[PDB]
Design a protein around this ligand. Structure first.
Ligand SMILES: Nc1ncnc2c1ncn2[C@@H]1O[C@H](COP(=O)(O)OP(=O)(O)OP(=O)(O)O)[C@@H](O)[C@H]1O
Ligand SMILES: Nc1ncnc2c1ncn2[C@@H]1O[C@H](COP(=O)(O)OP(=O)(O)OP(=O)(O)O)[C@@H](O)[C@H]1O
Lengths: 514, 514
C-alpha cells in the first residue's frame, strides 16, 4: 500500500488541526504583530548573560524546527526566522494563561509557524532565549518536514520542492541573497553613470538571425506566430539611435535547447549600450564593477574559491590577444590572410601536433577555435580579457582600428569559462545589412526595422553583456546553475520516479518507528 | 514609381558617404572622447555672457538637427544630446585645419552624429555655443529625418519606428524616464524593508487556474508543452513558505488576449509578499510608497493632471467598504446571505432603478459588480481604497476577521481605474485545495506542488500587486499604454499600409521641392 504512513500522518494532522479549531483556537490567525525579528533580537539582547532576564516585552514569529521538553511545565523550542534560530523557553510559571499554556504546548508540531510574546533572556546554559507570556499557532504544518540536513546531494528532490530545500538547507539561501546582491551592484554602477534601465519586448514577430533555437508561441487576435527573445540587443541599440545615450536591461532570455549544469531554458543576462565609448572603456568599467562586487563580498578585491584557491579581482585584470596567444604557443607567427589557404594548411600542423584533434568540417574558424579552446583556455583561471578576435571568428563585429584581420571586442574569462563580453559595436549600416542578409542565407526574413534604425545614423557605441546566472555561480563557488536559480526547469516526473520517491519517503519514517 | 525620392536620397547619400571615405575621411570613427555632455555644458558655462569666450577646451558629441549658415566661413549647427541642444558656431578663422573645415562643413547632413572640440562661449545673440577647433562626422545619417515635431498624433507611425519618435518628439523621453523612476522607487522602498528581489519562472508546465488565455509554447528536448506566466504569485508564496519572509518581483507577464489603450500582450507588474502582515499594513505601505514617488515628481504629495485638475496623494488616502458604499447609495441595507435569493431579488430592484441595466447571466456577483461599476466607481477620482469585497466577489481570498460575508483585501482606485491591490493571503491549505479544484472544474490539471508547499505551513502573509505600466500611465498623464511602453506590440503591416505610408512620406518631400 503505497506511501501508507505519510497519508496517515496528513489525515491525522488535519484531524488534530480541526479538533484544535473546535477547541476554540483559530489555527490560521489573521494578524500577529511581530515586534522584532530574531536577527534583530540577537543583535539587541546578546549582551545578556546567564539567568539574566530583560524587562522588555517583545514578540517574535517563525518556524518550529525543534520541540523538546524536560518537563511538563518546561518546554524548549528552536524557532527559526531569517535562517537564524532563537530558543523559546516555555515555562508554565511564566505563562499568563495556564489553561492555554497546556493546549499550545501540546498542539505545536515540528514545522508549525508560531508567534510568541515574552521576555528576552539568556539561560544558565548560555543559550539566548525568550520566555513567553503568551504564544499562538500562526500556521500548522500538515506534513513531516525532513531532517536537517536532507538532500545532499540528490539535487532533484531539492529543486523540485525548493520550499523544502530552503528550510532543511538554509545555507542555500546565502546563494540567492548573493545573486540579488549582484544585480543591485550592476544596476547601481550603471545608474550612477547616467544609464537608463529599460524594458524591451520578450515576444517578437521576427525570429532573429541567431542560430539558437527559439521558443515559439502564437498570438490569437493578430493570428501571428511570435518568438521569445534570444537577446535585447537590437531594441536597446534602437534606443541609442533614438537619443538615449546610455541604456541597459537586466532581462530574461529564452533558448529552446538542452538542459545541463550550465544551461537552463530561461536565463538572465545584463546588456548595456553606451554611446561614444569603446571596448577599452568597457574593460575598465568591468574591472571596476566586478571589483566593487567582490570587495563587498569580502573587503578586498581578492576572493577565495574551492582545498582552497584565490581569485584575484585586483585591477587591472590580465589581458591577452587571441592570435597573439595562439602564435605565442604555436612556435612562431601565422601566415597572412588567416581565412586563407596557407593559414589553414598551417593550422592543421599544430592541429596534429599539440595533442589537438580538431573536427569536421575543418573550417579555419573551427580549427582556430579548437586550438584556442583546448590549449589557451585551459589555464586561464584568473580574470583575463581575451581581445582582438579575428573577423574569421567575429561576423557581426567592427574591424580593429589598427592591426588588420582583427576586431574590437573582448571576452572576459574567469575559471575556465566566459563570464562577460563587450564590443565596439558595428555602426556601419551597409556592412550591417550585408552581414544580416549573408547570415539569413547562411542559416537557410531579416529585421528591416533595425536596419532602418541604424541607417538613421547609429552613434559610435560600446556594448556589454554579462551572464547573471553564471557570474552568480562563480561567486557562490558552485558548479551547478540550478544552485543560483530558485525554480530551475525540471523534467516533469511520471509515476515511476514519483512512486519511488514517496516509497523512500516512507522508508525514512518506518526506519524511525521501528 | 513608388517612393521615388527617398530611394534616390538614400542612394545619393550612400554615394556622398563613400566618396567622403575615399576623400580620406572615415565616416564611422571608432572612438571620439567626449569630455562633457551638453547638459553638463549648460550647467557649467551658463554663467558666460555675450561675446565672452571661455579659455577651456571641451569636446561634445550629439545629433545635428539644424545646419544653417549665414556665410561660407560661418555656420551654425543645432547639436542635440540627452534631449537638450547646444549650438555649434563653426567659424573658419577659429578652426585649425582650414582644409578639413571646408570638407566637414559641407559633408554634414541633418541627422549626422558629430563630435566637436572647442571653446565654450555665449554669442552676441545670447545663444550659448561652442566654437570648434576641430570636428568630425561620427556617424552619417542616410535618411531624411522628419521635421520637428512630426507624428502628432498618428500613433502607429510613431510606435512602429520608436527610434524616430524619440528624436522628433523628445518630450516622449520624459515619459520613459518617469517609468524607470517609478520602478526604482518601488525597489528601494522594498529593499530598505528587508525584501529580497527574486526571479521566478516565466515558462511553466502548468497553465494556471486563471481564466486569462495564456501564450503557449513548446520545449523540444523535454518534448513538453509549456505556458507563459500570468502571475508570479505561486512561486513567491512558495518562497515565503521556504523561509524567505519578504520577497518581491517586478516582472513581465503575458496575456494572449486583446490589444487596446490599456492592454498590451506583455506587460509589467510588481508583486510582493510579506510574512506577518495584513492588508492594513499594505495600505499604509502603499500610501507611503506612492507618496514618496509623487513627492519626488513634484515636491509635495499633490500632483496635477489634465484643463488642469489635482490628484491628492496626501496620506491617508480615502477608504470605503464595498457593500457599505453600495448600501450607502441604494437607499438602505441589503438582505443577509448576499449570495442568496432575497439578495438577488433585491439587487435586481436597484438594477432596474439606478439607470443600471445589468447583463446575462444575472449572477449575484455580476449584478453587484455592475451596480458597483457604473455607480460607485464613477466619481472615484482621488486615490481611494475599496476594501472588504464579499466572498461572492473574492474566490481565492481570506475571510474577514470580524464582519461576516466579507474578505480582507482592497483595490486602490485612482482616476476611475484600479492601480494596485492587496490581500491578507489565504493560508488555509484545505480551503485553498478546495478552491483550486472547484476552480479547475469551473473552467472545464491543478498545481499540486504549490498545494504541497502551503500544506507545509504557509505563514500569515500580506500580498500586494501593482500595475507598473498603468501607474506609469497615470503619473505621465497619458491615456494610452503605448506611451509608457518603448516597443508596444504592433500588428505587422502588409504592403497596403506600407505603400501608403511611404507614398505619404514622399508627398512631404515633393511638397518641399515644389
Ligand atoms: N541556457 C543558458 N543558461 C544560462 N546562461 C546562458 C544559457 N545560454 C546562454 N547563456 C549565456 O549567454 C552568453 C552567450 O552564450 P553563447 O551564445 O555562447 O551560448 P553557448 O554556445 O551555449 O555558450 P556555452 O556553450 O559556453 O554555454 C553566455 O555568457 C552565457 O552565460
Ligand atoms: N494587457 C495588459 N496590459 C497592461 N496591464 C495589464 C494587462 N492585463 C492585466 N494588466 C494588469 O493586471 C492587473 C489585474 O488585471 P485583471 O486580471 O483585472 O485584467 P483585466 O480584467 O483585463 O482588467 P481591466 O479590464 O481593468 O484591464 C491590473 O492591475 C492591470 O494593471
Amino acid at each position: 500500500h503505497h506511501h501508507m504512513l505519510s497519508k496517515q500522518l496528513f489525515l491525522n494532522r488535519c484531524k488534530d488541526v480541526e479538533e484544535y479549531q473546535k477547541a476554540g483556537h483559530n489555527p490560521w490567525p489573521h494578524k500577529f504583530n511581530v515586534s522584532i525579528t530574531v536577527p534583530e533580537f540577537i543583535a539587541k539582547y546578546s549582551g545578556l548573560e546567564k539567568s539574566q532576564v530583560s524587562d522588555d516585552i517583545v514578540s517574535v514569529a517563525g518556524r518550529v524546527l525543534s520541540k523538546r521538553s524536560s518537563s511538563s511545565a518546561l518546554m524548549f523550542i528552536d524557532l527559526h526566522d531569517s535562517q537564524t534560530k532563537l530558543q523559546i523557553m516555555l515555562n508554565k510559571s511564566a505563562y499568563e494563561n495556564k489553561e492555554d499554556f497546556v493546549s499550545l504546548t501540546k498542539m505545536i508540531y515540528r514545522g508549525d509557524i508560531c508567534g510568541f510574546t515574552g521576555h528576552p533572556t539568556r539561560t544558565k546554559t548560555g543559550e539566548l532565549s525568550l520566555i513567553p507570556i503568551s504564544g499562538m499557532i500562526l500556521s500548522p504544518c500538515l506534513h513531516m518536514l525532513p531532517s536537517m540536513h536532507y538532500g545532499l546531494g540528490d539535487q532533484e528532490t531539492r529543486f523540485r520542492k525548493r520550499y523544502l530545500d530552503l528550510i532543511v538547507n538554509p545555507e542555500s539561501v546565502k546563494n540567492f541573497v548573493l545573486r540579488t546582491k549582484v544585480v543591485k551592484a550592476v544596476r547601481k554602477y550603471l545608474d550612477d553613470k547616467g544609464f537608463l534601465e529599460v524594458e524591451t519586448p520578450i515576444l517578437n514577430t521576427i525570429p532573429g538571425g541567431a542560430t539558437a533555437r527559439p521558443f515559439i508561441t502564437h498570438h490569437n487576435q493578430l493570428d501571428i506566430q511570435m518568438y521569445m527573445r534570444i537577446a535585447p540587443e537590437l531594441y536597446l541599440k534602437e534606443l541609442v539611435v533614438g537619443g538615449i545615450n546610455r541604456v541597459y536591461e537586466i532581462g530574461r532570455l529564452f533558448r529552446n535547447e538542452g538542459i545541463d549544469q550550465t544551461h537552463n531554458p530561461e536565463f538572465t543576462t545584463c546588456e548595456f549600450y553606451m554611446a561614444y565609448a569603446d571596448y577599452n572603456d568597457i574593460m575598465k568599467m568591468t574591472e571596476e564593477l566586478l571589483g566593487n562586487m567582490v570587495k563587498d563580498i569580502t573587503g578586498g578585491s581578492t576572493k577565495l574559491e574551492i582545498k582552497k584557491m584565490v581569485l584575484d579581482f585586483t585591477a587591472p585584470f590580465k589581458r591577452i590577444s587571441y592570435v597573439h596567444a595562439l602564435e605565442e604557443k604555436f612556435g612562431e607567427k601565422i601566415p597572412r590572410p588567416l581565412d586563407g589557404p596557407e593559414a589553414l594548411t598551417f593550422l592543421k600542423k599544430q592541429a596534429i601536433r599539440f595533442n589537438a584533434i580538431c573536427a569536421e568540417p575543418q573550417t579555419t574558424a573551427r580549427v582556430m577555435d579548437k586550438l584556442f579552446g583546448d590549449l589557451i583556455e585551459v589555464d586561464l583561471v584568473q580574470p583575463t580579457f581575451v581581445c582582438d578576435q579575428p573577423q574569421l571568428m567575429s561576423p557581426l563585429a567592427k574591424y580593429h582600428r589598427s592591426e588588420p584581420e582583427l576586431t574590437e571586442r573582448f571576452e572576459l574569462f574567469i575559471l575556465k569559462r566566459e563570464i562577460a563580453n563587450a564590443y565596439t559595436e558595428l555602426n556601419n549600416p551597409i556592412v550591417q545589412r550585408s552581414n544580416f542578409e549573408q547570415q539569413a542565407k547562411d542559416k537557410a526574413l531579416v529585421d528591416e526595422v533595425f536596419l532602418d534604425a541604424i541607417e538613421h545614423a547609429f552613434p559610435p557605441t560600446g556594448g556589454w553583456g554579462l551572464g547573471i546566472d553564471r557570474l552568480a555561480m562563480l561567486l557562490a563557488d558552485v558548479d551547478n546553475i540550478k544552485e543560483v536559480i530558485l525554480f530551475p526547469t525540471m523534467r516533469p516526473e511520471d509515476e515511476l520516479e514519483k512512486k519511488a520517491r514517496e516509497a523512500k519517503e516512507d522508508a525514512m519514517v518506518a526506519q524511525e518507528k521501528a
